[PDB]
């Protein structure tokens, strides 16, 4: 069936003090993703992938003195506004919070910031990373 057409979006943490980061991930942030799903019978399956990763987290480039270390973005499903089970990159999951009775659908997800390597090697300054999100019903 036709896959949904996902609208680009951005999750912005603004200022994040390095000293306050938890290696396991904190600074929890909820965000939404809007999409157009002409075919919406059955259940929606979403798969999120990224080019730079580490143990199921998105590895943010240029955020550590050691190029293979750095800031980490962990993604989680949502359960009625509450953080849900962690998302395994590259595998399908059904969003726990979906809104929109028509072809216009909106899902809610959660993200946390963590880091790889020593906190002292983290580099201050603007950071950016991206992930691909595909969604389709079945």
């Amino acid at each position: 069936v036709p896959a949904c057409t996902v609208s680009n979006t951005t999750v912005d943490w603004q200022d994040v003090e390095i000293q306050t980061l938890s290696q396991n991930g904190n600074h929890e942030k909820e965000f939404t993703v809007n999409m157009r799903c002409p075919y919406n019978l059955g259940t929606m399956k979403v798969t999120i992938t990224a080019t730079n990763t580490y143990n199921n987290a998105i590895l943010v480039q240029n955020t550590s003195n050691t190029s293979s270390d750095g800031l980490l973005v962990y993604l989680y499903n949502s359960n009625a506004g509450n953080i849900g089970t962690a998302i395994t990159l590259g595998t399908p999951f059904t969003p726990g919070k979906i809104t929109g009775n028509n072809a216009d659908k909106t899902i809610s997800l959660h993200a946390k910031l963590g880091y790889k390597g020593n906190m002292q090697n983290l580099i201050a300054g603007p950071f950016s990373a991206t992930a691909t999100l595909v969604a389709s019903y079945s």
């Binding site: 680009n8 951005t10 999750v11 912005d12 943490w13 943010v60 201050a124 300054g125 950071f127 992930a131």
Partner: peptide, 11 residues
Amino acid sequence: SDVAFRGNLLD
């Protein structure tokens, strides 16, 4: 599509 994650790490 894509989801961008951004921010500013401060010392």
